[PDB]
Amino acid sequence: ERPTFYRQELNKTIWEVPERYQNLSPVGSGAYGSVCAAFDTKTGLRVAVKKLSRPFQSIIHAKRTYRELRLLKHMKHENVIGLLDVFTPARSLEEFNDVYLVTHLMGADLNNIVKCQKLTDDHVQFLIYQILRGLKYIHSADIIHRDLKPSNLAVNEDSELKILDFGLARHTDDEMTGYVATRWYRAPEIMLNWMHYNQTVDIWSVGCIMAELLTGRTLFPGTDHIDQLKLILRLVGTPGAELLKKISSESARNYIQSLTQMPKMNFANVFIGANPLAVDLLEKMLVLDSDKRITAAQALAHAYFAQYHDPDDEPVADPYDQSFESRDLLIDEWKSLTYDEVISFVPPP
Numbered sequence: 001e002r003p004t005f006y007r008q009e010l011n012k013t014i015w016e017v018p019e020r021y022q023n024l025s026p027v028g029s030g031a032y033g034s035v036c037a038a039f040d041t042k043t044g045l046r047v048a049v050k051k052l053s054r055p056f057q058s059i060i061h062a063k064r065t066y067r068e069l070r071l072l073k074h075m076k077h078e079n080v081i082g083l084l085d086v087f088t089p090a091r092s093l094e095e096f097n098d099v100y101l102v103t104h105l106m107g108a109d110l111n112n113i114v115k116c117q118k119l120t121d122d123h124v125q126f127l128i129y130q131i132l133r134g135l136k137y138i139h140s141a142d143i144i145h146r147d148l149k150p151s152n153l154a155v156n157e158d159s160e161l162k163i164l165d166f167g168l169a170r171h172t173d174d175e176m177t178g179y180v181a182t183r184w185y186r187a188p189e190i191m192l193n194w195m196h197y198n199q200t201v202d203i204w205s206v207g208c209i210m211a212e213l214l215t216g217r218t219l220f221p222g223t224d225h226i227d228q229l230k231l232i233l234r235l236v237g238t239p240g241a242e243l244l245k246k247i248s249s250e251s252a253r254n255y256i257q258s259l260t261q262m263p264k265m266n267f268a269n270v271f272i273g274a275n276p277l278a279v280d281l282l283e284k285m286l287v288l289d290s291d292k293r294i295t296a297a298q299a300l301a302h303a304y305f306a307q308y309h310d311p312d313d314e315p316v317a318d319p320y321d322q323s324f325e326s327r328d329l330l331i332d333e334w335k336s337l338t339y340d341e342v343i344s345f346v347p348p349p
């Protein structure tokens with residue numbers, strides 16, 4: 001039941017897709033890869049389509065292609081980007097050399113829309129509520145986003161949100177250097193590799209994002225790793241004895257101890273005028289010791305989200321098997337695994 005495909009060239013790139021997809025038009029000019037907006041005549045849905053070209057040029061790329069396909073296929077939740085379709089014009093494994101990923105078209109990211117703007121409390125409630133609802137789902141699958149930031153939150157005109165880029169963290173050191181948003185939303189334990197981190201790193205990011213929506217200002221806009229750590233500790237206090245022991249990195253621990261101790265600041269005096277429940281939630285997300293941060297499941301039940309919370313409509317996911325991460329396979333083996341995942345795709349109900 002292979003559909004009929006047609007070809008067209010968009011900004012020097014050939015797109016060969018099923019007839020059901022019409023009105024293809026480029027988006028982003030290429031800064032984020034080959035992406036097009038389109039209309040899915042079969043479902044009546046506006047869609048975003050990403051074409052991965054030569055996804056098997058090396059072991060590293062082949063494995064990355066497999067990883068992204070596996071992650072996207074696993075996610076089926078309103079607040080997480082997932083797959084409406086995935087296809088290849090190839091008729092066999094031999095000619096298989098391109099992968100197209102189809103998702104809901106959102107059309108904008110939170111950073112591009114609200115940067116530098118203070119949002120109303122009810123708007124922050126709605127936006128953070130959806131982020132946490134999607135995070136609860138992602139975390140229940142044993143997946144860590146690792147790089148949550150405004151630019152990774154796809155939003156439409158009605159402020160509906162879907163989380164992008166979960167589980168794909170390949171930021172170069174240079175990209176994390178200096179006065180950059182690539183590092184401002186990172187939990188300290190991961191920014192400076194203090195210990196083996198876990199899903200709690202994402203809650204810190206949500207805290208950074210929430211504070212910024214409430215104030216219109218980046219919470220920890222460090223000029224570099226060290227400056228940023230100082231900005232963080234000035235707000236949440238230097239590490240106590242209990243947390244110091246959890247820092248398994250001897251070098252990191254020794255550096256932290258060289259700093260003058262500081263107490264946690266009063267958040268009501270930092271976030272002046274904010275809803276007391278938002279201040280309380282921020283204090284519960286922005287805890288230095290990750291073991292003590294509120295989890296996404298617990299935060300959804302927090303009073304701040306009383307107007308949105310519904311325990312019968314905050315679904316969890318099936319467990320995600322990432323055992324493949326520990327394997328070293330050849331390009332062709334990764335490619336065959338990817339091909340299997342493409343041909344076994346089953347459209348959403």
Ligand SMILES: O=C1c2ccccc2C(=O)N1CCCN(c1ccc(=O)n(-c2ccccc2Cl)n1)c1ccc(F)cc1Cl
Nearest residue numbers: 028032035048049050101103104105106107108109151154
């Ligand atoms: O990650 C970004 C981003 C962030 C901010 C601004 C623009 C962009 C962008 O083009 N990308 C790359 C595309 C990221 N993807 C999606 C999906 C839906 C979606 O509305 N957008 C999207 C986000 C912001 C501006 C335009 C678009 Cl079209 N992006 C995406 C994810 C997974 C998949 F399988 C296919 C696709 Cl097409």
